[PDB]
């Protein structure tokens, strides 16, 4: 935001410095170079601002912005859960074959060349540990949420 207000160009004609700093509060934010290109310090000044808030507001915006209702107490497309599980593991196989491809050019050229050289083609490492996480958290939530309803509902 950076609220401003004019300074008199008359004192700029006087060659005199206004605004007489009595507190280490002004020169805390460095000005932007574009406003420095503009009238910056010859026609206006910046003002440090902040905000006023209260828990009366903090709770009633925190507790209301992103809220599920009873959605995790569902089962999430119970045929397509295992089908999607297949639909990750199947290409995870060939991606693991690429992990059986990419390790073998170690004991070779330096790892900085094994850093610049890998900007055209995918790596199995990071792409692998992504899908392990996705399968993991995808499965365990459906498992536990599937099992609570057995107790709660009869």
């Amino acid at each position: 935001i950076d609220a401003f207000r004019l300074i008199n160009a008359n004192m700029m004609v006087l060659g005199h410095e206004p605004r007489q700093t009595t507190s280490n509060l002004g020169h805390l934010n460095k000005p932007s170079i574009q406003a420095l290109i503009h009238g910056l310090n010859r026609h206006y000044y910046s003002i440090t601002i902040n905000y006023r808030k209260n828990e009366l507001e903090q709770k009633m915006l925190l507790n209301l912005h992103k809220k599920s209702w009873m959605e995790g107490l569902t089962l999430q497309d119970y045929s397509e859960h295992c089908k999607h599980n297949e639909s990750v593991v199947k290409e995870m196989l060939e991606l693991a074959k690429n992990y059986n491809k990419a390790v073998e050019e170690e004991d070779k050229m330096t790892p900085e060349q094994l850093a610049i050289k890998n900007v055209g083609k995918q790596d199995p490492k990071r792409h692998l540990e992504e899908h392990v996480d996705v399968l993991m958290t995808s499965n365990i939530v459906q498992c536990l949420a599937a099992m609570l309803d057995t107790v709660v509902f009869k």
Binding site: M136, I140, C143, L144, M147, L148, T150, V151
Partner: protein
């Protein structure tokens, strides 16, 4: 021989002692196998008449078959030992896995994201 189901050979040894009397020991041994046969009637058998299980131990016809036939089942009947081979009630438990697995899955989630 007491390890496997050698019974008759054990009751041959009972008597076939070569060393000395050993009587106080083979009478504890005469008992701790009396409750063992007295459990061995309790397996899934047919109607046993009043001769077969009557002669499996070492008795002709005392009321020791009334001691065991009134102690356990296989009750005195029309030449009859009764088979209450029920074994029915204990399966079909999801809720005890729905508590224990509710423990174990949380135990998975603890050592999965929470740094240790």
């Amino acid at each position: 021989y007491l390890m496997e189901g050698s019974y008759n050979k054990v009751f041959l040894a009972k008597g076939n002692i070569p060393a000395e009397s050993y009587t106080f020991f083979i009478d504890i041994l005469l008992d701790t196998i009396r409750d063992e046969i007295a459990g061995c009637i309790e397996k899934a058998y047919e109607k046993i008449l009043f001769t077969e299980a009557t002669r499996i131990l070492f008795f002709n016809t005392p009321k020791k078959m009334t001691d065991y036939a009134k102690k356990r089942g296989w009750v005195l009947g029309p030449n009859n030992y009764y088979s209450f081979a029920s074994q029915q009630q204990k399966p079909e438990d999801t809720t005890i896995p729905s508590t224990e697995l509710a423990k174990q899955v949380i135990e998975y989630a603890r050592q999965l994201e929470m740094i240790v």
